[PDB]
Amino acid sequence: EQPEYKDKLIKLIKDGAISLGGGELIVRLNKRDMELIDDSTLWNLEKEVENATKKVTVLKKGEPVDIAGGCIIETADGLKSLDNSLEAIFNRNLNVIRARITEKLF
After folding, report:
1. Could you give the CA distance from residue 63 to residue 31 in angstroms, rounded to a whole number?
2. Going from the N-terminus, what domains does the chain have, and what CATH number goes with each?
3. How far is CA 100 from CA 16, 24, 29, 85, 90, in A?
4. Alpha-carbon gap, residue 101 to 2, rounded angstroms
5. Residue among 76, 94, 66 nearest 24 (CA)
6. Which residues contact 68 (CB under 8 A, 6 or more apart)?
7. How does it sit in the membrane?
8. Dihedral sign from CA coordinates of 93, 98, 100, 105
């Protein structure tokens, strides 16, 4: 299989849910290799979406990305960029500042 974190992708879209507070956010997934994959179980994706929030989320366009799908709203009042590159190039930005916070304002 090798697709062990292919359920992490769903654990990432669900993470973006509450972090968006989205009713209908047309989730633009991580290319076709995800646009055919993550949107194979559709009513299983929109489960906890209408739960904690208000309404259910339906994925749409399949724009080529990295590893994780950025869930941007149709009524573009907001745009959560939960990509892999915005989590792995952002996780360093967390540490580089935190290493800078090992002396700052002393």
Report:
1. 5
2. 8-100 (3.30.2320.30)
3. 28, 39, 34, 22, 15
4. 38
5. 76
6. 9, 12, 30, 82, 83, 84, 86, 87
7. Peripheral membrane protein
8. positive
Q: What separation in angstroms does the CA of 69 have from each of 10, 53, 95?
A: 9, 19, 23
In this structure, what token pair is assigned to residue 94? Answer: 């967390």
Q: Quick count: other Cβ atoms within 10 Å of Cβ 46?
A: 17
Tell me how the structure was determined.
X-ray
Tokens standing for residue 70: 């950025």
Structure token digits, residue 17: 């849910």
For the CA atoms of 76, 12, 6, 33, what is the dihedral angle to 10 degrees? 20
- What is the secondary structure of 9-62 as a DSSP string? HHHHHHHHHHHHT-SS---B-SSHHHHTTTTSS-TTTTTTHHHHTSS-------
Residue count (the chain): 106
Note the resolution in Å, 1 decimal: 4.1
